[PDB]
Design a protein around this ligand. Structure first.
Ligand SMILES: NC(=O)C1=CN([C@@H]2O[C@H](COP(=O)(O)OP(=O)(O)OC[C@H]3O[C@@H](n4cnc5c(N)ncnc54)[C@H](OP(=O)(O)O)[C@@H]3O)[C@@H](O)[C@H]2O)C=CC1
Ligand SMILES: COc1cc(Cc2cnc(N)nc2N)cc(C#CCCCC(=O)O)c1OC
Length: 186
C-alpha cells in the first residue's frame, strides 16, 4: 500500500497511446498480463488498487469499465463526481496517495498500481518512497501522440528476475514483446 507500482506497455520509441487509444492493434495476450498483475493481490480479502488519469479511464471500452475486481480511482481537476463506475475521484495524486494510506482503506487494499496517463506516470516517478516499474517492451515502433518518461538507470535498477514474471520474449499478431521490472528503493 506504500510502494508504488507503475505498469505500462511502450514501443521502441517510448510510444504510448494514439488519438485516444493504443498506437498498436489490440494485443489481447498483453492485456492478460496487465490484468493478472494489477488484479492479483498477495492476500485474500484484499483487492489491489489502480489509479489513472481521466483520459485513460474514458479511453477504456465501457464494456471493460470499471476494471473489475480492482478498486478504481480516477484523477481529475474538473469532474466533481466520480464518473459512473469509478470507486473514488481525487483532484491530485497526493490526495489519492494520502487516501489510500487511511486506516479505513489500509484494511482492504494491498498493492497499488498506476495504470494510465503520461503525467500520472511522471509525478508517480517524481517522489520519494519505494517505486517499481513494470514495463512491457513492445519491440516495434508505432506512431504515437503520448510517451513514457525516461528511466534513469542510475536511479532505477533492472531486476534480473521478479516473482510471477516470465522473461522470455513473447509475440502476438507478428508483434514481439517482453516484460521487465525496475526498482527504486528509498
Ligand atoms: N501504452 C500504454 O500502456 C498506455 C497508454 N495509455 C494512453 O495514453 C493516452 C492518454 O494519455 P494522457 O493524456 O497522459 O492521459 P491521462 O489519463 O493521464 O489524462 C490526463 C487527465 O487526467 C487527469 N490527471 C492526470 N494527472 C492528474 C493529477 N496529478 N491531478 C489531477 N488530475 C490529473 C486530468 O483530468 P481533467 O482534464 O479531467 O482534469 C488530466 O487532463 C491515450 O492514448 C491512452 O490510451 C493509457 C494507459 C496505458
Ligand atoms: C485505453 O487503452 C487501454 C489501456 C490499458 C492500460 C494498460 C495496458 N498494458 C499495460 N502494460 N499497462 C497498462 N496500464 C488497458 C486497456 C484494456 C483492457 C482490457 C482488459 C482489462 C482488465 O484488466 O480487466 C486499454 O484498452 C484497449
Amino acid at each position: 500500500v506504500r510502494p508504488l507500482n507503475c505498469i505500462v506497455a511502450v514501443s521502441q520509441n517510448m510510444g504510448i497511446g494514439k488519438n485516444g487509444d493504443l498506437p498498436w492493434p489490440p494485443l489481447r495476450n498483453e492485456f492478460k498480463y496487465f490484468q493478472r498483475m494489477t488484479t492479483t493481490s498477495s492476500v485474500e480479502g484484499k483487492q489491489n488498487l489502480v489509479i489513472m488519469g481521466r483520459k485513460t479511464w474514458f479511453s477504456i471500452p465501457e464494456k471493460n469499465r470499471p476494471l473489475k475486481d480492482r478498486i478504481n480511482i480516477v484523477l481529475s481537476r474538473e469532474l466533481k463526481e466520480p464518473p459512473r463506475g469509478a470507486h473514488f475521484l481525487a483532484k491530485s495524486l497526493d490526495d489519492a496517495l494520502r487516501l489510500i494510506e487511511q486506516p479505513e482503506l489500509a484494511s482492504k487494499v494491498d498493492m497499488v498500481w498506476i495504470v494510465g496517463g503520461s503525467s500520472v506516470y511522471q509525478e508517480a516517478m517524481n517522489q520519494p518512497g519505494h517505486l517499481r516499474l513494470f514495463v512491457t517492451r513492445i519491440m516495434q515502433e508505432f506512431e504515437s501522440d503520448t510517451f513514457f518518461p525516461e528511466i534513469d538507470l542510475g536511479k532505477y535498477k533492472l531486476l534480473p528476475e521478479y516473482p510471477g514474471v516470465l522473461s522470455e520474449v513473447q509475440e502476438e499478431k507478428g508483434i514481439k514483446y517482453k516484460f521487465e521490472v525496475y526498482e527504486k528503493k528509498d
